[PDB]
Amino acid sequence: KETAAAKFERQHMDSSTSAASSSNYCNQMMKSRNLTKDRCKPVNTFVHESLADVQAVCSQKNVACKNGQTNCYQSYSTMSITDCRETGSSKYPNCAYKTTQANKHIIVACEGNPYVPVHFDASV
Numbered sequence: 001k002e003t004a005a006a007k008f009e010r011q012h013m014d015s016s017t018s019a020a021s022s023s024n025y026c027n028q029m030m031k032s033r034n035l036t037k038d039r040c041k042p043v044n045t046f047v048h049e050s051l052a053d054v055q056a057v058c059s060q061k062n063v064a065c066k067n068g069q070t071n072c073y074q075s076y077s078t079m080s081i082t083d084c085r086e087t088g089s090s091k092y093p094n095c096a097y098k099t100t101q102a103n104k105h106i107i108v109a110c111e112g113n114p115y116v117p118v119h120f121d122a123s124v
């Protein structure tokens with residue numbers, strides 16, 4: 001039974017690579033983080049920074065979340081991210097993803113003690 005903080009780590013952290021280097025990155029990573037068990041998760045972003053740097057965003061720029069809550073924070077600097085999005089031809093259990101690498105600010109929602117990211121809201 002996964003904690004919110006651990007679910008964020010599993011779904012969104014990939015510190016082992018600096019960037020997505022191939023078109024199949026999302027296919028491989030969505031499968032290995034168990035995001036295609038029982039259904040194809042339609043959209044998911046991976047962050048290629050250290051966990052410490054992502055946790056530090058909870059002390060950066062406080063902004064509104066898309067849902068209206070006020071516990072979201074925007075990173076001061078851009079970060080290396082990979083957006084993974086199901087293609088139109090994807091259908092469970094043969095999930096298929098488009099891989100888009102970018103450098104953008106991240107917006108996360110933070111909660112708890114310690115105060116850590118629990119939701120990925122957007123990137124800018």
Ligand SMILES: [Cl-]
Pocket residue numbers: 010033034
């Ligand atoms: Cl898992």
Ligand SMILES: [Cl-]
Pocket residue numbers: 043044045120
């Ligand atoms: Cl996401």
Ligand SMILES: [Cl-]
Pocket residue numbers: 062
């Ligand atoms: Cl401010």
Ligand code: NA
Pocket residue numbers: 003004005006112
């Ligand atoms: Na938690």
